[PDB]
Structures are given as C-alpha cells and as structure tokens.
Amino acid sequence: QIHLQESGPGLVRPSETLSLTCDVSGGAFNDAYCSWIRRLPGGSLEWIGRISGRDGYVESNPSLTGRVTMSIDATWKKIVLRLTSVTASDTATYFCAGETPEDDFGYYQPYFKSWGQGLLVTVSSASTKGPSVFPLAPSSKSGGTAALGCLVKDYFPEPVTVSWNSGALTSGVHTFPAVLQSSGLYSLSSVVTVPSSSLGTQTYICNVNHKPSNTKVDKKVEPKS
Amino acid sequence: NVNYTNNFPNIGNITDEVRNCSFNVTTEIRDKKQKVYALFYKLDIVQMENKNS
Amino acid sequence: NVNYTNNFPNIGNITDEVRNCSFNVTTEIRDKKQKVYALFYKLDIVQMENKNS
Amino acid sequence: DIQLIQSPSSVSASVGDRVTITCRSTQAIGTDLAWYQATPGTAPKLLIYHSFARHEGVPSRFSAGGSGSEFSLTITGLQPEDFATFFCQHYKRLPLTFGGGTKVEVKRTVAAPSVFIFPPSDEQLKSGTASVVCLLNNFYPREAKVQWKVDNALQSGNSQESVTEQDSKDSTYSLSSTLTLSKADYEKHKVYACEVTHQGLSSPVTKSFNRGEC
C-alpha cells in the first residue's frame, strides 16, 4: 500500500543543512512522483519541490531553488531530503505525498491522495532544557469567582506532557496551545477554567509531566487582597 | 438512458459496436498528459500490437 | 544614444512600444534548437495565460 | 505563482448547514484545482479532484463544482468529522499553492465567561517576571479583544494570547490574559486594568488590578 511515514532528525538547529528522511508502506513509486509539504503552525501551508520518481530530475520551490536536494535510487521506498540553510519559517509540520500515476481525467495531475504521518519539525535556536511553574493566586478566595492557574515558561523539546491532579481531572480542565517565543524557546501558561460556584474548596494542582523531571508542584487558591 | 427507447424494430443498439477512445495531449508540466475523449466507430480503428491501443 | 537626438516633435520614443522577445525555435535541422532573440512591436503580440510570457 | 485567497476566511455552522466556500484565484486556471480536508491532528485527504469530480469513498454531500477563476464547495450533510479547515489546491501551473485557510466551526454551546484579577504569588515576585491575569472561561466566539493599559500604552509579546481550539465536551473557548512582564516595568506601573468586551457576554465588565499587597 502507498502509505507514508517520516521523522528525519526531528527538532533541529538553525543555519544547518537538515536531512528529513521519509518512508513508504511498500507502494513503490515506480512511475509516480513524490513530494514534500510544509504546513506552517496553524492557517496556511506551503509546497516544497516535488521529485520525479521515474527519473533523476528534481523540481524545487522557486524561492528555495537550490536549497532542496534528495537521494533517489533503485528502491522506491527510500526518499530522504537534504534541505539546506534552515530558516526561522521552517518550523512546521512536514509531509510526504505520492503523485497520481494514472486516472480517467488525466495522468500526472498533482491531486495528492496518499499522505504521511506528519511531524512538527521546528527551527528552535537553542535547547535551553525545560520549564518552570508559576502560580496564579487570586486576589480573593467585576465577578465573584477566583480562578487559579499555572505558567510553564521555556519548555523543550516540543512537546512536553502536562496533566492535572495526577490525571484525576475533576471538571472541565484544559491546556493552552503551544506558542513559541522570539528567542526560539517554547512557553505556556497552564491555567484551568474555574466555575463561578465552587470557591475556596476546589484544588487544581498542575501536573507538568516532563520526561526526565516529571514534577507535580502544588498550586492552590488563596486570597491576595 | 430510457430502457424501452420506444423500440419498434428491436433490432439492437450501438453498444459493443463503437469504441469510446481517448488519446494523450501535451501539457506544460514535465511528463503530464490529459485525455481528450471522443467516440469513434469500430470501422475506423484497428489494433496492431500493444494490446489496448 | 546621444542626448538631443534632434527631437523635432517631442512625442516620445520606441520604449513601451517594442519588446525584447527571446524564444527558442528549431534550425533547419529537425533536432537542433537555439535561443533566438528578436524585437517585436507590442501591436503584433498578444498576452496569454501565465502572464509573464 | 497562482495564489488562492479562498474567501471567506472563517465561518460557523451547525450539522447539515448550507455554508459554501468560494476559492478566489489570482488568474484563471481552467478546471485544474483540487480539494483537501484537514481534520485536526491528521493529514489532508482529497475531497474534490479536477474541481468537480467527487472523490471515491466520500459521499455526494460535497456539492462542488465551478470553472474559471471561481470554485465553490457547498456542504449539505455537515458532520462532526467534517468540522475542519479546507484548502483548495491549484495544479495548472508551477509552483503549486494551497488555500488561504478556511476554518469551519460549530454554531452551538453559547456560554458566557467570568473574568477576574489575579496578583502574582511568591514565585513570580522572586523570579524576574510576574503576571497579571484576566482569565476568560467558557466564552464564544474568538473575538476576545483584551485591552491593557501600561502607563497609557499597550504592549504585545508578554500579552500571551492564544485562544484554545473548540472543545467537544463543552464546545466553547477558554483564554487567559497572562502578562509575563519583568518587574522593571511590571512592578513599576502600580495599577493595572484589563478592558474586555464580548458579544457572548450580555454585560461585559472591566477588571482593574492592584499592585500586590495593595
């Protein structure tokens, strides 16, 4: 079957020539073409230059004409790229896709059907280890509700697991989406939705379940009036 | 179509007497071709080799 | 060109009226193609899709 | 070389609505345009190839068609799975460009939020940066226009604003007003105030912050 999977090197460092490998589920591209797809975080996405599976020809993004190179050989299941000069806009979810070999309307029309797993490959400029937790103690125990929370700044690598109350979530807990920073590190402010009825008794301990650290720093509601 | 087709003579139908044919036409993209379909009678097409051509 | 050019009418010049077109066509040999560049006036040329050629 | 506006940018609809998305192309591309369904967390799947040929497997609810520079994909039987963005892809000329982004949203679960002020705890004050939060809980839609005054000014970046995506248990939105500002100017401005209004809020309120012990 023509099913695709790619991981390459994962999260990388800027100003370096990365190599994002990709694989096939046995559907050899003997006549079809393979291609890359870059999907920016949210919103739109951009197409990276496709490859000619049958021949040795390489097509590229006009703005990135010389930046992309791939390795092709007799086996059709091994497609690995050699993207050069990774930039700040390369932090996106890459993809693999297979060109239509034949159809009743046309033959090589790019209406990609087979698609890969897809992973978020970033361009974070530094490792910078892991996050820290910041409480959100309310003024009271305009509004009558007092909502606590947490702030987990500079977490790496993307992603890092977070839960609540050792997994024993009580009611309507949630987490904010991942947002990057200008320096390259990833920060988040894990604040939970709080009802305007049960106050002074509810507890929302923040479970930052980082892979090496895995700490469960306490966080409760207290007056700050 | 209408199956009855008001068949007074009931002689038959064109089916299995014409060969609905298509051929490639060039395009700007490298190695990409379309189909320009047409209908031709069997008396104006022959096959030499390369079955289904 | 020279500066004055003896501009009797002062009406303009061939710029924005002639185009430098550099296409590629065959020679007398059926298997030899060369980039032939020629000048054609804008009244002899129409613009088609992919609006850069 | 052929950008695709794909207007409108956003739309909210319920199950089995009659919302349509029209793809705006910079030049005529004939009928060479494809479609994709970007279900959250998954790769896009082709929906309408050749701009009118319905893909195999998927039903005929996708009332698509059109030729020239305009293409509309109207959905009849809207489904919970179909609530995802759509990207129409042209393939007539190189390079290939995708759609501009058309996120589709549920119409339901109109819930109102509750906003409050929250002073920094010990960990923020001892650390370099603290935060003043005007947390928004269970609101709708994504038009939370939080206003912040800091010495007669508003600053971005530290205003870590990222509204959560639509939920399935509550199908509403949660957003916080975290202001990660260092005490050099955070603690400098004694009094803060967040000005928020929301159409889901019948009576939007403005919350003002008092410096720490104050």
Ligand SMILES: *[C@@H]1O[C@H](CO)[C@@H](O)[C@H](O)[C@H]1NC(C)=O
């Ligand atoms: C004609 O020459 C141009 C210039 O390199 C080239 O791009 C084009 O492919 C040529 N046309 C042919 C070989 O038919």
